[PDB]
Amino acid sequence: SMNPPPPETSNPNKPKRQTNQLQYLLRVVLKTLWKHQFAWPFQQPVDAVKLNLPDYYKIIKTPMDMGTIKKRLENNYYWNAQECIQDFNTMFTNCYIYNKPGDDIVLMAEALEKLFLQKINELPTE
Ligand SMILES: Cc1ncc2n1-c1ccc(Cl)cc1C(c1ccccc1F)=NC2
């Protein structure tokens, strides 16, 4: 029983770019979530082996985590802000899908998502 490879943090075939919205996403949006008290289960790829979740990667076929996003932003992996927002959005949704609606993790993701939404209200005009 094995974990999949984590999502790529670089691809030499994918065009790279820095935008003031991607800078804002790293310096502000990601710093804000990363430092949160509820950030810890989302700072890395979901370890199905270590966590005892043999069904996790049968259900969630597009995993994403903030460690992957942070590394993506640091390597200019994204072309635009929408790409990154999407990865964040995937992360949240993944959590919503797999967990029972009253699990603690679900409440944590909701707390991080409302924070996410607040922060991206001040995303610069590109
Ligand atoms: C992301 C994610 N989706 C599903 C899981 N997780 C998760 C990931 C990492 C860690 Cl350290 C715990 C959990 C936890 C978890 C988090 C907080 C409280 C209890 C838990 F089982 N559950 C499995």
Find all residues with CB under 8 Å of 79, minimum gap 6, and list them.
14, 15, 16, 17
Give the distance, in angstroms, between the CA of residue 76 and the centroid of all CA atoms in the same chain.
15
Report how far residue 20's alpha carbon sits from residue 41's, in angstroms, rounded to the nearest whole number.
28
Report how far residue 90's alpha carbon sits from residue 125's, in angstroms, rounded to the nearest whole number.
23
Q: Which residue has the tokens 């996410």?
A: 116
Domain coverage including residue 98: 19-123
Q: Residue 102: phi, psi to the nearest 5?
A: -100, 0
Structural domain tally of the chain?
A: 1
Residue 70 lies in a domain: yes
Short-list 86, 120, 107, 85, CA closest to 38: 107
Q: Which long-range contacts (CB under 8 A, 24 or more apart) does 84-91 make?
A: 84/22, 84/25, 85/25, 85/120, 88/29, 88/64, 88/116, 90/62, 90/64, 91/42, 91/64, 91/65, 91/66
Q: Is the CB of 77 under 6 A from ligand 1?
A: no
Short-list 33, 106, 107, 37, CA closest to 70: 33
Residue 6 lies in a domain: no
Q: Looking at the chain, after which residues does the C atom sit over 2.5 Å from the next written N, breaking the chain?
A: none
Report how far residue 53's alpha carbon sits from residue 47's, in angstroms, rounded to the nearest whole number.
8
Resolution, Å (one decimal): 1.8
How crowded is the C-beta side of 72, counted as CA atoms within 13 Å? 26
Q: Is the CB of 67 under 6 A from ligand 1?
A: no
- What's the CA-to-centroid distance between 49 and ligand 1, angstroms? 12
Residue 3 lies in a domain: no
